[PDB]
Design an enzyme around this catalytic site. Structure first.
Site, PDB file in Angstrom:
ATOM      1  CG  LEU A  71      17.836   0.497  23.936  1.00 48.39           C
ATOM      2  CD1 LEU A  71      19.239   0.218  24.392  1.00 48.39           C
ATOM      3  CD2 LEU A  71      17.783   0.508  22.410  1.00 48.39           C
ATOM      4  CD  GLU A 131      24.459  -3.377  20.659  1.00 54.56           C
ATOM      5  OE1 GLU A 131      23.796  -2.534  21.305  1.00 54.56           O
ATOM      6  OE2 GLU A 131      24.827  -3.188  19.470  1.00 54.56           O
TER       7      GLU A 131
HETATM    8  N1  LIG Z   1      17.916  -0.059  19.122  1.00 51.44           N
HETATM    9  C1  LIG Z   1      18.465   1.020  18.529  1.00 51.44           C
HETATM   10  O1  LIG Z   1      19.479   0.936  17.858  1.00 51.44           O
HETATM   11  C2  LIG Z   1      17.795   2.349  18.665  1.00 51.44           C
HETATM   12  C3  LIG Z   1      18.300   3.488  18.029  1.00 51.44           C
HETATM   13  C4  LIG Z   1      17.636   4.695  18.183  1.00 51.44           C
HETATM   14  C5  LIG Z   1      16.465   4.756  18.927  1.00 51.44           C
HETATM   15  N2  LIG Z   1      16.017   3.648  19.534  1.00 51.44           N
HETATM   16  C6  LIG Z   1      14.771   3.672  20.292  1.00 51.44           C
HETATM   17  O2  LIG Z   1      13.785   4.162  19.400  1.00 51.44           O
HETATM   18  C7  LIG Z   1      12.927   5.083  20.072  1.00 51.44           C
HETATM   19  C8  LIG Z   1      13.124   6.487  19.523  1.00 51.44           C
HETATM   20  O3  LIG Z   1      12.992   6.475  18.097  1.00 51.44           O
HETATM   21  P1  LIG Z   1      11.690   7.063  17.375  1.00 51.44           P
HETATM   22  O4  LIG Z   1      11.655   6.561  15.961  1.00 51.44           O
HETATM   23  O5  LIG Z   1      10.521   6.787  18.292  1.00 51.44           O
HETATM   24  O6  LIG Z   1      11.906   8.668  17.436  1.00 51.44           O
HETATM   25  P2  LIG Z   1      13.080   9.611  16.842  1.00 51.44           P
HETATM   26  O7  LIG Z   1      13.193   9.530  15.344  1.00 51.44           O
HETATM   27  O8  LIG Z   1      14.371   9.544  17.627  1.00 51.44           O
HETATM   28  O9  LIG Z   1      12.395  10.994  17.238  1.00 51.44           O
HETATM   29  C9  LIG Z   1      11.310  11.449  16.424  1.00 51.44           C
HETATM   30  C10 LIG Z   1      11.235  12.957  16.551  1.00 51.44           C
HETATM   31  O10 LIG Z   1      12.481  13.466  16.075  1.00 51.44           O
HETATM   32  C11 LIG Z   1      12.252  14.595  15.227  1.00 51.44           C
HETATM   33  N3  LIG Z   1      12.627  14.189  13.854  1.00 51.44           N
HETATM   34  C12 LIG Z   1      12.736  12.932  13.386  1.00 51.44           C
HETATM   35  N4  LIG Z   1      13.153  12.930  12.095  1.00 51.44           N
HETATM   36  C13 LIG Z   1      13.321  14.214  11.733  1.00 51.44           C
HETATM   37  C14 LIG Z   1      13.764  14.926  10.518  1.00 51.44           C
HETATM   38  N5  LIG Z   1      14.086  14.228   9.406  1.00 51.44           N
HETATM   39  N6  LIG Z   1      13.808  16.275  10.570  1.00 51.44           N
HETATM   40  C15 LIG Z   1      13.487  16.960  11.686  1.00 51.44           C
HETATM   41  N7  LIG Z   1      13.085  16.381  12.831  1.00 51.44           N
HETATM   42  C16 LIG Z   1      12.993  15.037  12.901  1.00 51.44           C
HETATM   43  C17 LIG Z   1      10.798  14.967  15.381  1.00 51.44           C
HETATM   44  O11 LIG Z   1      10.763  15.797  16.543  1.00 51.44           O
HETATM   45  P3  LIG Z   1       9.717  17.009  16.753  1.00 51.44           P
HETATM   46  O12 LIG Z   1       8.432  16.285  17.111  1.00 51.44           O
HETATM   47  O13 LIG Z   1      10.285  17.840  17.873  1.00 51.44           O
HETATM   48  O14 LIG Z   1       9.666  17.697  15.419  1.00 51.44           O
HETATM   49  C18 LIG Z   1      10.171  13.626  15.700  1.00 51.44           C
HETATM   50  O15 LIG Z   1       8.952  13.789  16.433  1.00 51.44           O
HETATM   51  C19 LIG Z   1      13.286   5.005  21.536  1.00 51.44           C
HETATM   52  O16 LIG Z   1      12.547   3.881  22.060  1.00 51.44           O
HETATM   53  C20 LIG Z   1      14.740   4.610  21.484  1.00 51.44           C
HETATM   54  O17 LIG Z   1      15.163   3.946  22.666  1.00 51.44           O
HETATM   55  C21 LIG Z   1      16.640   2.477  19.399  1.00 51.44           C
HETATM   56  N1  LIG Z   2      24.224  -0.832  18.139  1.00 53.36           N
HETATM   57  C1  LIG Z   2      23.417   0.067  18.737  1.00 53.36           C
HETATM   58  N2  LIG Z   2      22.961  -0.274  19.969  1.00 53.36           N
HETATM   59  C2  LIG Z   2      22.171   0.551  20.605  1.00 53.36           C
HETATM   60  N3  LIG Z   2      21.696   0.262  21.823  1.00 53.36           N
HETATM   61  C3  LIG Z   2      21.808   1.798  19.995  1.00 53.36           C
HETATM   62  N4  LIG Z   2      21.003   2.672  20.638  1.00 53.36           N
HETATM   63  C4  LIG Z   2      20.705   3.802  20.040  1.00 53.36           C
HETATM   64  C5  LIG Z   2      19.830   4.801  20.778  1.00 53.36           C
HETATM   65  N5  LIG Z   2      19.848   4.630  22.240  1.00 53.36           N
HETATM   66  C6  LIG Z   2      18.716   4.123  22.923  1.00 53.36           C
HETATM   67  O1  LIG Z   2      17.659   3.776  22.023  1.00 53.36           O
HETATM   68  C7  LIG Z   2      21.013   4.907  23.045  1.00 53.36           C
HETATM   69  C8  LIG Z   2      20.840   5.098  24.407  1.00 53.36           C
HETATM   70  C9  LIG Z   2      21.928   5.337  25.228  1.00 53.36           C
HETATM   71  C10 LIG Z   2      23.201   5.382  24.693  1.00 53.36           C
HETATM   72  C11 LIG Z   2      24.341   5.689  25.654  1.00 53.36           C
HETATM   73  O2  LIG Z   2      24.068   6.024  26.813  1.00 53.36           O
HETATM   74  N6  LIG Z   2      25.541   5.583  25.159  1.00 53.36           N
HETATM   75  C12 LIG Z   2      26.759   5.881  25.923  1.00 53.36           C
HETATM   76  C13 LIG Z   2      27.077   4.791  26.976  1.00 53.36           C
HETATM   77  C14 LIG Z   2      28.080   3.696  26.631  1.00 53.36           C
HETATM   78  C15 LIG Z   2      28.306   2.812  27.905  1.00 53.36           C
HETATM   79  O3  LIG Z   2      27.292   2.239  28.373  1.00 53.36           O
HETATM   80  O4  LIG Z   2      29.483   2.783  28.339  1.00 53.36           O
HETATM   81  C16 LIG Z   2      27.874   6.224  24.855  1.00 53.36           C
HETATM   82  O5  LIG Z   2      27.650   5.832  23.661  1.00 53.36           O
HETATM   83  O6  LIG Z   2      28.845   6.866  25.278  1.00 53.36           O
HETATM   84  C17 LIG Z   2      23.370   5.212  23.326  1.00 53.36           C
HETATM   85  C18 LIG Z   2      22.286   4.960  22.514  1.00 53.36           C
HETATM   86  C19 LIG Z   2      21.243   4.068  18.749  1.00 53.36           C
HETATM   87  N7  LIG Z   2      22.003   3.223  18.109  1.00 53.36           N
HETATM   88  C20 LIG Z   2      22.332   2.052  18.730  1.00 53.36           C
HETATM   89  N8  LIG Z   2      23.124   1.174  18.088  1.00 53.36           N
END
Ligand SMILES: NC(=O)c1ccc[n+]([C@@H]2O[C@H](COP(=O)([O-])OP(=O)(O)OC[C@H]3O[C@@H](n4cnc5c(N)ncnc54)[C@H](OP(=O)(O)O)[C@@H]3O)[C@@H](O)[C@H]2O)c1
Ligand SMILES: Nc1nc(N)c2nc(CN(CO)c3ccc(C(=O)N[C@@H](CCC(=O)O)C(=O)O)cc3)cnc2n1
EC number: 1.5.1.3
Length: 186
Positions: free
Chosen positions: A22, A30
């Site tokens: 993140l 959160e």
């Molecule tokens: N703030 C938030 O709410 C939140 C939520 C989620 C993630 N994140 C952050 O976002 C980053 C990860 O997300 P990202 O966009 O980089 O990657 P991601 O979508 O989680 O992973 C991408 C990989 O997933 C597979 N993939 C994705 N879509 C697919 C589909 N429709 N069908 C089949 N395979 C699929 C592929 O793997 P293969 O290469 O093996 O085919 C692709 O290389 C991390 O930094 C994480 O911490 C944040």
């Molecule tokens: N609103 C909101 N916020 C985000 N951060 C978010 N993150 C993501 C994806 N990632 C990081 O990219 C995560 C990384 C770790 C956890 C995790 O370890 N979860 C535990 C621990 C709970 C605790 O700490 O007790 C659980 O869910 O049980 C969940 C998501 C997706 N969707 C989110 N949507």
């Protein structure tokens, strides 16, 4: 199965990730919101299913995988085998959703939660039909390499309130944020 939902936390500059994690410091409440919303089933005898891409799976610390109380499905086109700890591995989002329509899975799965990353959100958000977006607005810019697309308000309605969601501005570690719920029905 029940409704289809995305949940995400986004910075002011629409960032969701940086270097596989993140972009902001850990926000305890959160994370607790993410946990509560994705785990809480509205139907007795069922669990929710979380669908995520491969990089999002590995962004969860190993000690927390699979996400407890939820069925964990990972999307990957290239993995030979499901990642250790995952409950399901699917080659496409359509394959994942059709899995939820299997009778013995449908009677155990309530809500389906898309929990990222970028490409998974984008595909889900353009899928016609009922969809909710649970969006945490992190009210600060953060350096990011992974982003969320800006929400089309002609399609998604910002709900004025939602059961179980606090509407007041929150703050942890000097970072203000607020919980939003959007809904489309196209
Ligand atoms: N703030 C938030 O709410 C939140 C939520 C989620 C993630 N994140 C952050 O976002 C980053 C990860 O997300 P990202 O966009 O980089 O990657 P991601 O979508 O989680 O992973 C991408 C990989 O997933 C597979 N993939 C994705 N879509 C697919 C589909 N429709 N069908 C089949 N395979 C699929 C592929 O793997 P293969 O290469 O093996 O085919 C692709 O290389 C991390 O930094 C994480 O911490 C944040
Ligand atoms: N609103 C909101 N916020 C985000 N951060 C978010 N993150 C993501 C994806 N990632 C990081 O990219 C995560 C990384 C770790 C956890 C995790 O370890 N979860 C535990 C621990 C709970 C605790 O700490 O007790 C659980 O869910 O049980 C969940 C998501 C997706 N969707 C989110 N949507």
């Amino acid at each position: 199965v029940g409704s289809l939902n995305c949940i995400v936390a986004v910075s002011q500059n629409m960032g969701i990730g940086k270097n596989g994690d993140l972009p902001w410091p850990p926000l305890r409440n959160e994370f607790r919101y993410f946990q509560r919303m994705t785990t809480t089933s509205s139907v007795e005898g069922k669990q929710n299913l979380v669908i995520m891409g491969k990089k999002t799976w590995f962004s969860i610390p190993e000690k927390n995988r699979p996400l407890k109380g939820r069925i964990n499905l990972v999307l990957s086109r290239e993995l030979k085998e499901p990642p250790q700890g995952a409950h399901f591995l699917s080659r496409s989002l359509d394959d994942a959703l059709k899995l939820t329509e299997q009778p013995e899975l449908a009677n155990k799965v309530d809500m389906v939660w898309i929990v990222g990353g970028s490409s998974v959100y984008k595909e889900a958000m353009n899928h016609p039909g009922h969809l909710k977006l649970f969006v945490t607005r992190i009210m600060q810019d953060f350096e990011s390499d992974t982003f969320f697309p800006e929400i089309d308000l002609e399609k998604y309605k910002l709900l004025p309130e939602y059961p179980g969601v606090l509407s007041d501005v929150q703050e942890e570690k000097g970072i203000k944020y607020k919980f939003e719920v959007y809904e489309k029905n196209d």
